[PDB]
Design an enzyme around this catalytic site. Structure first.
Site, PDB file in Angstrom:
ATOM      1  N   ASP A 150     -37.264 176.902  53.418  1.00 46.84           N
ATOM      2  CA  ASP A 150     -35.864 176.951  52.826  1.00 46.84           C
ATOM      3  C   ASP A 150     -36.018 178.641  52.279  1.00 46.84           C
ATOM      4  OD1 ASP A 150     -33.545 177.117  51.485  1.00 46.84           O
ATOM      5  OD2 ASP A 150     -34.067 175.610  50.166  1.00 46.84           O
ATOM      6  N   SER A 162     -23.008 192.053  54.863  1.00 48.50           N
ATOM      7  CA  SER A 162     -22.525 192.190  56.176  1.00 48.50           C
ATOM      8  C   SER A 162     -21.310 193.144  56.295  1.00 48.50           C
ATOM      9  CB  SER A 162     -22.139 190.596  56.554  1.00 48.50           C
ATOM     10  OG  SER A 162     -21.376 190.857  57.846  1.00 48.50           O
TER      11      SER A 162
HETATM   12  C1  LIG Z   1     -32.393 169.287  53.184  1.00 44.10           C
HETATM   13  C2  LIG Z   1     -32.066 170.206  52.178  1.00 44.10           C
HETATM   14  C3  LIG Z   1     -31.489 169.974  50.794  1.00 44.10           C
HETATM   15  C4  LIG Z   1     -31.198 171.210  50.036  1.00 44.10           C
HETATM   16  C5  LIG Z   1     -31.572 172.419  50.495  1.00 44.10           C
HETATM   17  C6  LIG Z   1     -31.551 173.628  50.082  1.00 44.10           C
HETATM   18  C7  LIG Z   1     -30.850 174.780  50.868  1.00 44.10           C
HETATM   19  N1  LIG Z   1     -31.043 176.402  50.472  1.00 44.10           N
HETATM   20  S1  LIG Z   1     -32.495 171.973  52.044  1.00 44.10           S
END
Ligand SMILES: Cc1ccc(/C=C/N)s1
Length: 330
Positions: free
Chosen positions: A35, A199
């Site tokens: 992540d 971007s």
């Molecule tokens: C499965 C997930 C829930 C929250 C996340 C964080 C994203 N930046 S990954």
């Protein structure tokens, strides 16, 4: 040193990607969601409330000869979808695709929210944003990448996510066979702890490119592409029958549609997201209304280049003294 690991979609929609990670001695292999939008490495564990575990593989620190309690340390995190987890902390040996870090903070969940319990395929998260976002208290901890960086051949990692197919996370090197053309690098602000960049604009389908600055984050842990309402309206206006549904929670479109591509600018370069990447399938089983992969960021506070965008590119996360991002077509 370097590491290289395959990342695999958890389902037929590419809702998230899991990568195997070895923790402890002997190794315990857990499948973690890498992540780039957060900075905690946390796992389902032998300490997780039993009713909140449903099929995940757990880390058991008492079975690891290299695990050590990080005394007094706790963690607690909330994510953009409203999910959350919390617990205590061990240090242990963590390896990804052959790259080993000793003394990595492994955050053991005591509690997880229902969305995590319900995802039996995700055993935890491995955060790859900047360590200033790590939630461990009272002593903030470093990410796996930050701990590995000095040992790496080059202070970089790359994300090569597949469309309905496996892909690769590499650490310490750039695989010049994995992309076409050249990599275009662009500036990063670390002020909010994210891989935040600007971007240079967008196009819808075969339409003309609109030059406009769009500040956002490169976030492998977010499924979709979240952009300003003006941009998202311009996209869905090209799809007959598409509409924003407050009851569903975003733009939906007839499943019979053929979607146009979406192009985003990286400096003078262009990354093209094919229309099929923007189809997230029926809103409920058997429905002929399909959920869109480009959604408004208006309610978030930040634009998010999630997996829909990133999987169309080979993406370099350059952790040099001044970080930058690189994008190439592939
Ligand atoms: C499965 C997930 C829930 C929250 C996340 C964080 C994203 N930046 S990954």
């Amino acid at each position: 040193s370097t590491g290289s690991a395959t990342t695999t979609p958890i389902d037929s929609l590419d809702d998230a990607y899991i990568t195997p990670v070895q923790i402890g001695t002997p190794a315990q292999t857990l499948n973690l969601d890498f992540d780039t939008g957060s900075s905690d490495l946390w796992v389902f564990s032998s300490e997780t409330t039993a009713s909140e575990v449903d099929g995940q593989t757990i880390y058991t620190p008492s079975k690891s000869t290299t695990a050590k309690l990080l005394s007094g340390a706790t963690w607690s995190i909330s994510y953009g979808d409203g999910s959350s987890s919390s617990g205590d902390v061990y240090t242990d040996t963590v390896s990804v695709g052959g790259l080993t870090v000793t003394g990595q903070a492994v955050e053991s969940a005591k509690k997880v929210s229902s969305s995590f319990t319900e995802d039996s395929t995700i055993d935890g998260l491995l955060g790859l944003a900047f360590s200033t976002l790590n939630t461990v208290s009272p002593t903030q901890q470093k990410t796996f990448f930050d701990n590995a960086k000095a040992s790496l051949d080059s202070p970089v990692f790359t994300a090569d996510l597949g469309y309905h197919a496996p892909g690769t996370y590499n650490f310490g090197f750039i695989d010049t066979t994995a992309y076409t053309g050249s990599i275009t690098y662009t500036a990063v602000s670390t002020k909010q702890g994210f891989w935040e960049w600007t971007s240079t604009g967008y196009a819808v389908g075969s339409g003309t490119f609109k030059s406009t600055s769009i500040d956002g984050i490169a976030d492998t842990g977010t499924t979709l592409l979240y952009l300003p309402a003006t941009v998202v309206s311009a996209y869905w206006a090209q799809v007959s029958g598409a509409k924003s549904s407050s009851s569903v929670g975003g733009y939906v479109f007839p499943c019979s549609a053929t979607l146009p591509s979406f192009t985003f600018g990286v400096g003078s370069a262009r990354i093209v997201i094919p229309g099929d990447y923007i189809d997230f399938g029926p809103i409920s089983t058997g429905s002929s209304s399909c959920f869109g992969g480009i959604q408004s960021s208006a309610g978030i506070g930040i634009n998010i280049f999630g997996d829909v965008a990133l999987k169309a590119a080979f993406v370099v996360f350059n952790g040099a003294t001044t970080p930058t991002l690189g994008f190439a077509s592939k």
